[PDB]
């Protein structure tokens, strides 16, 4: 017997997480998904599933799984849910209205905040339109906020579209960095590729 376990370690324990605007996607397929690895964890700030019970995750098969991950600030984690609005849901990472899957987050202040501010983590503050679900925009075009053209240069009412969180360890809990993992579960008209343990 060969039991290819889905590499959830590579997702949850990654040393580096993506900026939310450049959110990372890892395909999870042709593997046994064993969620029991998370059962004895208690420092996740949120762990919610949509269309499936967390209690049944080891008892279900899916045609495909994606693991999306990124960093946002604590009071933005509420936007990583179906039917949300705000700067993250609108301009950075958009879940579908009928999302099937799980959203897990945890405070990463210790790893991701620096005295003086961590400027490595960015989000998109400006966009002409909202993202479609699971859309990614990594464009760096200067945003026209006023009546005057920008000509691809920063200036008055002409803003670089990405802005830094500048995470500092003494930020309020709502402004501290949180690492987020979104597990997307597909149930298409195709063979199951991801099942819980037998």
């Amino acid at each position, epitope marked *: 017997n060969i039991t290819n376990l889905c590499p959830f370690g590579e997702v949850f324990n990654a040393t580096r997480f993506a900026s939310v605007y450049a959110w990372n996607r890892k395909r999870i397929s042709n593997c046994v998904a064993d969620y029991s690895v998370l059962y004895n964890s208690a420092s996740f700030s*949120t762990f919610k*599933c949509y269309g499936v019970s*967390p209690t049944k995750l080891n008892d279900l098969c899916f045609t495909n799984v994606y693991a999306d991950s990124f960093v946002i600030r604590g009071d933005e984690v509420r936007q990583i849910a179906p039917g949300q609005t705000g700067v993250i849901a609108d301009y950075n990472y958009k879940l579908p209205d009928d999302f099937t899957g799980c959203v897990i987050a945890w405070n990463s202040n210790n790893l991701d905040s620096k005295v003086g501010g961590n400027y490595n983590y960015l989000y998109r503050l400006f966009r002409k339109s909202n993202l479609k679900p699971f859309e990614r925009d990594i464009s760096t075009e200067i945003y026209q906020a006023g009546s005057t053209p920008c000509n691809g240069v920063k200036g008055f009412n002409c803003y670089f579209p990405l802005q830094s969180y500048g995470f500092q360890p003494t930020y309020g809990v709502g402004y501290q960095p949180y690492r987020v993992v979104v597990l997307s579960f597909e149930l298409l008209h195709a063979p199951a590729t991801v099942c819980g343990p037998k």
Partner: nanobody
Amino acid sequence: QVQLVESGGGLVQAGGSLRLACIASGRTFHSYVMAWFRQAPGKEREFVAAISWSSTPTYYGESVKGRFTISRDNAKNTVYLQMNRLKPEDTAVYFCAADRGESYYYTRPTEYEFWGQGTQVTVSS
């Protein structure tokens, strides 16, 4: 979004029964996990029961297992809490809560977006 209206609480004698109802309004009811919490004077909101979209699973606080039953009528947009063999220790404000998500940490108040105003339950001796 979702409004929650509790009812069926009030005064009951030790040993007696009550049935709380919460009507959830404004979004597809079977899209929401429904829960009951309770708050005694100077205490935190304590988890009582929750019920997933389909009616399964159900979850119970250790102190009400075998005495309380949570149920939902997806046609009436209503969640119920049947409370039997009530003790004085069950006296508290009972809150209806709702969320689109089912939490692994289902006992956490912070995992529920929507909250009723609560209704008083008083169990006298």
